[PDB]
Amino acid sequence: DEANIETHGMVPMNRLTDDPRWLPAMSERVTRMVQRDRNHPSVIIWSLGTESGHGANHDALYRWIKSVDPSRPVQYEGGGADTTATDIICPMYARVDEDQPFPAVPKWSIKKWLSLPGETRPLILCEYAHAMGNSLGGFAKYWQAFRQYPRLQGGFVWDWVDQSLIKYDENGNPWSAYGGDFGDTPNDRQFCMNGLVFADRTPH
């Protein structure tokens, strides 16, 4: 269960989440979620949101959940996927054997990530195997690793269903539309379609 918080477009990404002025707004998105869904057994992990960098507000809210509901681990990928605000190493698109040493927030090979000096947490990708169009190449490599490494406990494919929308031609025939087809601009065209199934749930 994930809080409705994402400030991806900010520069840097944690500009708001590290600002105490936004702590109240963020806290409500976290605390009200917990108060609402804390009795559902299906919910086994709480998430502070996504792509909002790592701000002090995250640390405060991470602790609030740990204090209010100890029965569920708390995770958050922002700021490097292994910050002090997450109980689980939850990278997005970190590869199996290849490192992507980006400055500040590198994406280490998941196998290498587990044994970095002093690291002991389990690793579960919150996003991996981007299923955009003709994709999922190398998917088998992730599962061989998941099965061989005890602490590599899986991940969440990105994602389930294409976010395409229906439009109609002059004859009333419907067609699948993506970014920009509604005169919307700027737009990121087909990047909204990353699913394993088509919008009508027909499988890719």
Asked about 170 being catalytic, the answer comes back as no
Phi and psi at 103, nearest 5°, equal -65, 145
Tell me how far, at minimum, the Cβ of 183 lies from its own copies, in Å.
49
Buried b (16+ CB within 10 A) or exposed e, 53-86: bbbebbbebbebbeeeeeebbbbbbbbbbbbebb
Instruction: Kindly state the helix (H) or strand (E) to which residue 30 belongs, with its residue range.
Output: helix 23-37
Tell me if 191 contacts Na ion by CB under 5 A. yes
Tell me how far, at minimum, the Cβ of 179 lies from its own copies, in Å.
38
Tell me if 15 contacts its own copies by CB under 8 A. no
Tell me if 80 contacts its own copies by CB under 8 A. no
Stretch that binds its own copies, among 25-33, 53-61, 107-115, 192-200 (CB under 8 A): 107-115
**Would you give the binding string for Na ion spanning residues 121-160, x where CB under 5 A is met?**
-------------------------x--x--x--------
Tell me if 67 contacts its own copies by CB under 8 A. no
Closest CA to 198 of 184, 180, 177: 177
Catalytic residue among 28, 51, 77, 119: 51
Identity of the amino acid at 102: F
Q: Is it true that the peptide bond before 91 is cis, omega within 30 degrees of 0? A: no
Tell me if 153 contacts its own copies by CB under 8 A. no
Instruction: Compute the distance between CA of residue 107 and CA of residue 156 in angstroms, rounded to an integer.
Output: 16
User: How many Cα neighbours within 13 Å face the side chain of 42?
Assistant: 2
Of the candidates 25, 44, 116, 166, which one interacts with its own copies according to CB under 8 A?
116
Active site residues: 51, 127
Residues that bind its own copies (CB under 8 A): 99, 109, 111-112, 114-120, 148-151
